[PDB]
Write a protein that binds this ligand. Structure first.
Ligand SMILES: Nc1ncnc2c1ncn2[C@@H]1O[C@H](COP(=O)(O)OP(=O)(O)OP(=O)(O)O)[C@@H](O)[C@H]1O
Ligand SMILES: Nc1ncnc2c1ncn2[C@@H]1O[C@H](COP(=O)(O)OP(=O)(O)OP(=O)(O)O)[C@@H](O)[C@H]1O
Ligand SMILES: Nc1ncnc2c1ncn2[C@@H]1O[C@H](COP(=O)(O)OP(=O)(O)OP(=O)(O)O)[C@@H](O)[C@H]1O
Ligand SMILES: Nc1ncnc2c1ncn2[C@@H]1O[C@H](COP(=O)(O)OP(=O)(O)OP(=O)(O)O)[C@@H](O)[C@H]1O
Ligand SMILES: Nc1ncnc2c1ncn2[C@@H]1O[C@H](COP(=O)(O)OP(=O)(O)O)[C@@H](O)[C@H]1O
Lengths: 362, 362, 362, 362, 362
DNA sequence: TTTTTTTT
């Protein structure tokens, strides 16, 4: 009779679809008789088999239309507008909710019908990291609180240690868990400005290890970067909004994000020391390294670097109540998986090997 | 009466033609008398001679239209939309089985009654290839599966070595096999982005003989590509979907494809070396030179460059079971045809001549 | 009564016009009475006087149309589509065969009943070219085969020799013969993209007198041409499809054409030297200066730099069977014409005149 | 009742207007009654007063139109299309003959009952110009021939010698005599892409005041025009079609025009020197200066800069036969008008005063 | 029951608006009843209250239109078209005469019965300006003739004198009297390209604050202004057209307008000095300082900045025959008003009183 | 929108 633009836009919202070509492509598939549709029969894609029957009648009429792309364009605008309306009104925790939500929806892929890897050696990495320092389970949820609360000045941690402390590898896992971006400070002041603009609207950041003048006595490479840092004062504080330099575009100005920093054992000014919520402190504990010499697969699957290992760790150790109300109901079912799939004695044996420097699976 | 955009699009889908000009041009040929059509009579191009009889009536009406380019637009979009929907809803495995079917379809024609090239000339290429490196098929199979798995970080291989070592030649055959793209990166960075646009929805990518810098005392002019690459490391990871770009079009959020790289032997930043799965060396060889002066027709016909040679090679060397179940029937059918065609004496006589470097066929 | 867009499209196709403003301007001329048409009466241009009477009735309606630019766009798009269809489906021999037939049509006009050009002045041009190099005739035939075969990494000829050696001139004649374009690579990288865009869907490219560096020892002003070109090793090799641009147009993927590089005598890095297949020397010969200074009709009519003189050279010298099967008869016909209009002794005299450095005619 | 677009296209053709705004703005004036049109009754502007009463009724309906800019767009397109057609089909001789015709209309108007000029003032300018160089009128004739002939590589004239020697004054007169525009090439190289875009479809070019190096020995201020020119080597040669670019436009491929280069006594490289036919060294001659001091009216009215001055010179000195055959009728009539007014005594009076350094106008 | 596009265009022409958004917003205000319109009632802006009552009805229909921006575009086109026609067809004297009428109109408001401004304070303005230089009112008349005649070479004036000696004040008032724009030359040459784009279609330019190289000779600050200038000898002398450019616009060509250069006591080459018609020396005179320090309404109301004050100065001092016949009537009416409102003794007293450095108006 | 601009 004629195409209902209404029904096309419903599907776009329903499927959260926001590519005009994908929307066109998928909606076109409904034009055959769902009554016999082989995808419906095999229930291969929910984005098809949940919808075909309702949309079929409209899809037959859509297939004949000479306006097809324009119908899909309006539909996608509705979905982009919905994101933009919502984006204006997120709490910081709601961001974190979604960041994690999507990682949970990735973790399916690791083990399920895709089955890309093994939840076992994943948990072996979880065991391997937990031993490095106290109570890592709590430490994550503590850092997490800080990044939602975003309390002025009370917003930053310093990972000080030697070189080869592991802090970079941890930093990878943290940023991998939480999002954000990494950034430099070891530049001529001249050049630096645009690098600072890279932060624009990241939730979180990490700063790369900064070349402390005179450090080469410590045999730590030494120079401009720390001189730059303390001149960046108010960016840390988050007291007031601040201008940001995009290349090839004009200024934007906003509250600078909270985040993380990395440090060899260089000199630190009192002023610079004063900024932090804490130092957290890292060193060689080489039986762990010899456990790695016996656990090499964790580097190969790269699980040791994994913020997903952190996600798994919280999913284990912490109270279900400790998660945000709704997504609690997801942590339940991963625990239901994990905790029957893995006893304490299993996790124990693993941690014992690591603590003994023995290969974690030995 | 009135153009059926339906029948236009149906031709576009069935040819997989995906350019408005190429579609526009070819469809216009159909406006003339099929009963007299010299192309149909001489069965010159199947993309014509099959379809003309069916499309003729509509093509005459199309030849009158004032809308012509707009009709071709909606047709071509249906082709891309189908591609992109498959680019999500297929496994990479099923993608290759689809790709292999299409190449097998070409082979069936090329050595059919049309038969327009000698099987033994084409096979002589396979000898040259499995002669270039040992275990050639086996490394080829290893590369293929690495590209099916596409597992993050372990997504890139390097070819490194001097001029005329053959590395370019091999990449061409793999790329003709796998259906990827080459990309050029010896270029200004803030102008490069649309090069990555080309990678949208592709299976695989190749980077060709990038300008490094330093060691140019060896007469190797320096350039920026290595800096560009390690700056662009964020793509190589396969970490998370990135929003790729194309002019006057909506951006395309996707995982960046895996790929392979070729290099005359500049320095690498060890960080840039840190990205790879593997290196392979390549070595100019006089005997593999001298043979071509006689066997010139191989290179004239680009045989040793072309992925059809690889497919014939894998059909030769590999177990039927190594191919996916879906295609294994055709693998049997084609093994039988190679088994019919050749004695090992023929094959080994040639491979002997190839080792001599003269008189490959004798 | 309405415009026939079909008549416009046919006109554009038949004249191979592919510029919307040329088409627009040309078609408007036909709005006047063809009987009174002084251009027809004079027979100024064939693209007019063959057509005016036939298109007159439609041009009178076109002159009133409100749509004009849109109609012309469609007609031009049809011509463009034909080129793309041809480019993908014809063998390179057919492309050259078609290009040869066209030049032979011009020669049917230039030396037609009008006698509009002097066949003796044109033939005189051939002799001066023939003395430009050793075995000139062979050198042309070799070059055509090379371009038609389009063999990987055997695709480029280097013309090298002093200022005013003749190399630019020989390139220019070959370029017209095959059809293709010149490109100025000395410009800076940021605009080279659209420079290379020129080459899309062309038979040859010519790179002109690229600047090297350090030859200012010899006062050869340095420039980036050589450095620029060594970014583009990939393009010369013809081994993989490259991505080409136009403004407000998405990239086109295809193989980069073969061609010629002219060269005042800067140095060459082996990466680039490896990619040429043949270097040809050129030298000042004062007696050619003395001849040209007394034979200046050669330059005024651009005879020696034009392509048609090379075709006449081929006709004078090659066995007919060396021409592609279809044109062989037209070659027989022109051979007879030339053999009739000139003796061999006349040609010997013309060569001798040039050898003496006297004006070509006595 | 509706707009005649044909009447607008006539006006655009008639005025040869090719700015949509200028066309629009003028056409809008015709909506008031010619009967009262004070511009008509002042009879000040030809492109108004000739036409108002014809277009009147259509201008009133155009005033009410909702489409106005589209109508003008089609009209300007037609005038533009006319130029492109002509730029292929005309000989350079017909072009020059046309350019003369238009200047001759302005000469008829200027010295008409407009009263608007004193031919005695303009003729004094001819005496000044003819005094500046030996054999001045033969120099103009030789230059005009050179531009009509456009012999490859033999295309450019180089003007040298001190500042304030009138070289740019002379260049302006030739540039107004022909069609063409000037360019400034001492620019940043990357901007130069759009600078050369100005040359598109024109007859002459003048490169204005190229700066070299070494001349700063005299403190000729140093610059890079010389080195920039030497990159445009193929543009000077005019041997093959170069690629030319405007903002937001795809390149048009075209033979770059012939022209003039003006400079002080910097050096020129071999390669660039080789590309000039003729070198004119102007010299300071203070009797000319003291004449001009007492001859202020020349520069006040821009006489000695102006191509109209040269044209009066040619009509004086050159035989009637030297003009293209069509205009010889008008030329004879203007020769009569000159001699009817100026006795040779008057011209000898003038040249005598100039030679004396006396104010010319006895 | 339709929008009259004509009434909207008449309003745009009437107000001389040429920004579509400024045009749009203002017209929509008329849709409310003018009869209670507070903007009418308060008599805020003439551009509103003159027209609200007239366009009310058409604005009421306009407010419902779905076409609104499309209407405004055609309206703005009309105003730009008027400027474009005027930009070619008027004498420089006629341009200035139009400019003067606008200032005279604005004076009728400022000093009206609605008069926002004290004509007595503005007369104090004229006193302080008349004190600033020798021979002031004859100096202005001579500057104006110079800009109107625009005689080549002899086009430019140089202001110099100490810091805080009035030079930019006078320049800004002259710039406002004529219209024009200021320019900054003290740059690296790359940006200088778009700087000059400002000058397109201006009647005047001012080169402010030209730094001399090595001005610390005087102990002035150094800068490249002078060395940047003297490249541009064509631009000042204005005998010939120059290419001019704005961001995102194709180049245009015109004579560069006449203007002023200002500086402190830097060096001037004779190469620069010969560019100038007159050099005006300013001096700090302390009674003016103490007068401003007792007459600050001058500064605070910006009186001595404003072109109106130079217009008033001309009206009071100059003979009527020095204006154009077009405006001589208005000049008489204003002269009558001022000669009624002020005695010669009273204004003579102000000049005497400013000579005392006491505040103007006691 | 791209392009041009920004950027070097
Ligand atoms: N191993 C080899 N031994 C000898 N000749 C070779 C070998 N491989 C390639 N060739 C010759 O070198 C030509 C170019 O090969 P190819 O482009 O693959 O080499 P490459 O090492 O990638 O070169 P480049 O670094 O210059 O691009 C081939 O066409 C063939 O003629
Ligand atoms: N072999 C020759 N001997 C003498 N004069 C020559 C010779 N070849 C060309 N000429 C003259 O040199 C002019 C320029 O020729 P051409 O442009 O082909 O030379 P080129 O070596 O390519 O120069 P360039 O590098 O400067 O462009 C010709 O027009 C002719 O006048
Ligand atoms: N031969 C001459 N001898 C003396 N004065 C001259 C001579 N020719 C020109 N003049 C004076 O030189 C003035 C400047 O002329 P013009 O701008 O054309 O000089 P130019 O030397 O060609 O300049 P540029 O090098 O800046 O292009 C003229 O207006 C005239 O007053
Ligand atoms: N002749 C003068 N005598 C005394 N004070 C003066 C005089 N002219 C200007 N002033 C004072 O100088 C201040 C600044 O004037 P103005 O901006 O025109 O100076 P300038 O020297 O032209 O500046 P600049 O060169 O920095 O642009 C005025 O506001 C006024 O206080
Ligand atoms: N417990 C440990 N014992 C010994 N070495 C360690 C330990 N943890 C980390 N390292 C060393 O740190 C090296 C680099 O890890 P990284 O995350 O980069 O630390 P950093 O950022 O401090 O350099 C590792 O290769 C490892 O040898």
């Amino acid at each position: 009779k004629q195409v209902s633009w209404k029904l096309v836009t419903e599907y776009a919202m329903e499927t959260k679809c926001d590519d005009v070509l994908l929307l066109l492509g998928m909606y076109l598939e409904f034009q055959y008789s769902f009554e016999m549709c082989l995808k419906c029969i095999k229930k291969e894609q929910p984005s098809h088999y949940k919808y075909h029957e309702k949309h079929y009648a409209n899809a037959a009429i859509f297939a004949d239309s000479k306006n097809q792309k324009t119908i899909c364009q309006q539909a996608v605008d509705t979905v982009l507008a919905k994101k933009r309306v919502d984006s204006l009104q997120l709490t910081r925790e709601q961001m974190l909710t979604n960041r994690f939500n999507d990682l949970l929806d990735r973790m399916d892929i690791m083990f399920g019908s895709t089955g890309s890897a093994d939840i076992e050696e994943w948990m072996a990495g979880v065991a391997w990291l937990h031993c490095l320092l106290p109570k890592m389970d709590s430490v994550v949820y503590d850092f997490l609180k800080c990044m939602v609360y975003n309390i002025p000045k009370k917003r930053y941690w310093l990972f000080k240690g030697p070189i080869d402390s592991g802090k970079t590898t941890l930093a990878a896992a943290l940023l991998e868990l939480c999002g954000g971006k990494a950034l430099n400070v070891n530049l001529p002041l001249d050049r630096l400005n645009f690098e600072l603009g890279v932060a624009i609207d990241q939730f979180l950041v990490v700063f790369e290890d900064v070349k402390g003048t005179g450090g080469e006595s410590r045999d730590l490479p030494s120079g401009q970067g720390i001189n730059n840092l303390d001149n960046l004062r108010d960016y840390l504080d988050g007291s007031v909004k601040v201008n940001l330099e995009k290349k090839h575009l004009n200024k934007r100005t906003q509250i600078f994000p909270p985040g993380i920093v990395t440090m060899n054992e260089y000199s630190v000014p009192k002023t610079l020391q004063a900024r932090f919520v804490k130092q957290i402190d890292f060193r060689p504990k080489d039986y762990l390294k010899h456990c790695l010499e016996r656990s090499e697969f964790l580097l190969e699957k790269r699980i040791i670097q994994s913020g997903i290992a952190l996600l798994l760790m919280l999913i284990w150790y912490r109270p279900v109540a400790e998660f945000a109300q709704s997504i609690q109901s997801r942590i339940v079912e991963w625990k239901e998986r994990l905790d029957k799939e893995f006893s304490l004695s299993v996790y124990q044996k693993m941690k014992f090997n690591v603590a003994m420097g023995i290969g974690v699976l030995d």
